[PDB]
């Protein structure tokens, strides 16, 4: 259902109640789905030392194949949508309307690269709460997919060509946001947890950590076929639901393979006083809310009467 409403509505994807909703919902779809052989969660309730809550539990080998989820209005509210083809979360929306439920969202937990998500209709879009704040995540949305193929054999494949063309579009949009005379450089992550340093995700129920350096090592505005990224399947990971650790059983299948569409990127720029005419961007991510937020940026829950 849809009903084009004629009036000026205000949006803000950085403070979208629905996101937290999705966040807690997904964390729950996970907990009942992907169970660890053991999870460790901190617990330093003041006291002297720190107690560590540890759970040892059944560890059935299964995979995460969630069905798309539609979010409808919660008792007492309604869902408004910004029909504008190119709208960046923060700001007023002229072409707005009421909707029954959201479009189907394929929940995907991962880092650096947003998979199987919505594509931008017009040109490429880059959203942030403050492009000026180099510490804030930049959500890049593509207008064109790019297939990423991975295997439990140890790698992920991607068109050197397609990925190339997609980067040009990104730096294009970027220099635009900062400086025309600026140069856009794409370097690898600066560091931190494994999950954040590498393009991490779960395929066939296993946790992949794939080195994305090859995807972020280029400068713009200043044989050859496929790009192979080395992955690694880990059994001990850092939880994303909360500060914690989890251990899973070793793989049981010798043929683990997944194909996804890269439909968005989570970037972060190295601000500082570089005082040059070039900005440096790196794969970011970690806060799954940005993932949810990349699909929900066009909705808002409104208290109805």
């Amino acid at each position, epitope marked *: 259902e849809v009903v084009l409403v004629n009036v000026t509505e205000n949006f803000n994807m950085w403070k979208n109640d629905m996101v937290e909703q999705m966040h807690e919902d997904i964390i729950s779809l996970w907990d009942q789905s992907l169970k660890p052989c053991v999870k460790l969660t901190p617990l330093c309730v003041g006291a002297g030392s720190c107690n560590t809550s*540890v759970i040892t539990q*059944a560890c059935p080998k299964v995979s995460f194949e969630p069905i798309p989820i539609h979010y409808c209005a919660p008792a007492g509210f309604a869902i408004l949508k910004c029909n504008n083809k190119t709208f960046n979360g923060t700001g007023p929306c002229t072409n707005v309307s009421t909707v029954q439920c959201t479009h189907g969202i394929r929940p995907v937990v991962s880092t650096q690269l947003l998979l199987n998500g919505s594509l931008a209709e017009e040109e490429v879009v880059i959203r942030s709460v403050n492009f000026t704040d180099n510490a804030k995540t930049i959500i890049v949305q593509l207008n064109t997919s790019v297939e990423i193929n991975c295997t439990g054999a140890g790698h992920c494949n991607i068109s050197r060509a397609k990925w190339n063309n997609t980067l040009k579009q990104i730096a294009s949009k970027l220099r635009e946001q900062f400086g025309n005379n600026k140069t856009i450089i794409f370097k690898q992550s600066s560091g931190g947890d*494994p999950e954040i340093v590498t393009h991490s995700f779960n395929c066939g129920g296993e946790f992949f*950590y794939c080195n994305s350096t090859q995807l972020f090592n280029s400068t713009w505005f200043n044989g050859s076929d496929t790009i192979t990224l080395p992955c690694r399947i*880990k*059994q001990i990971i850092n939880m994303w639901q909360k500060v914690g650790k989890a*251990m899973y059983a*070793p793989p049981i299948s010798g043929q683990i393979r997944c194909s996804s569409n890269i439909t968005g990127l989570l970037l972060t720029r190295d601000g500082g006083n570089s005082n040059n005419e070039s900005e440096i961007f790196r794969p970011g991510g970690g806060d799954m809310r940005d993932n949810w937020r990349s699909e929900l940026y066009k909705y808002k829950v409104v208290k109805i009467e």
Partner: antibody
Amino acid sequence: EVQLVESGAEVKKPGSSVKVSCKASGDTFIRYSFTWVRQAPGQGLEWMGRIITILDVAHYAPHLQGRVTITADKSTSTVYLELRNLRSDDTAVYFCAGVYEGEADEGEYDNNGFLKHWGQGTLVTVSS
Amino acid sequence: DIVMTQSPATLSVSPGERATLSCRASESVSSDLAWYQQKPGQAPRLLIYGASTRATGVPARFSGSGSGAEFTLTISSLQSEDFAVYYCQQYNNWPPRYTFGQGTRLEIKR
């Protein structure tokens, strides 16, 4: 491959508690899981429990649940076994054993159950 | 409560001949089954794990097969040093509550 050097023979009265140790050397300590196994004179092997050095988590045998604790100080590459409320039937040789798990430091952990590296064993006599 | 059981309590084999050791389980264990050899006054020695993989330094005359609740330890040609006690161990369950067979004593028959 790591070498398992166990502490010396113990002599205790029933009701007492003991703490036997095992020094691991030769490889990256946190890349192995350690298990304690005991054997009473003239009898077979009895699995007591195992610890996942990396996670610092441990699991014990049921009949043993309660009065046993296995630990490890990642600084001295030492594994410790502690048995409370000793009983005369607890008299046995206590074996410390280990197996390689992969690069735990890198998140790889096969969670291997078998035991490849063993210690000389520690005799622990419980008697009045 | 997974219980392992070794068939022959004592196997009397003539030197140079073959010997087959039996170990069954009261419940399925897939292939998480290991074998150990133990000489008097010594720590056990791992021979086979994963039911059939020979462990480093273990001669080829030693071989393991089976899965589920029935396992076999076959020593092709018994050597003077092969006489000892052998134990099987199931490490299938989770939480870990691994167990041992009561052992089979391999003795020189004369």
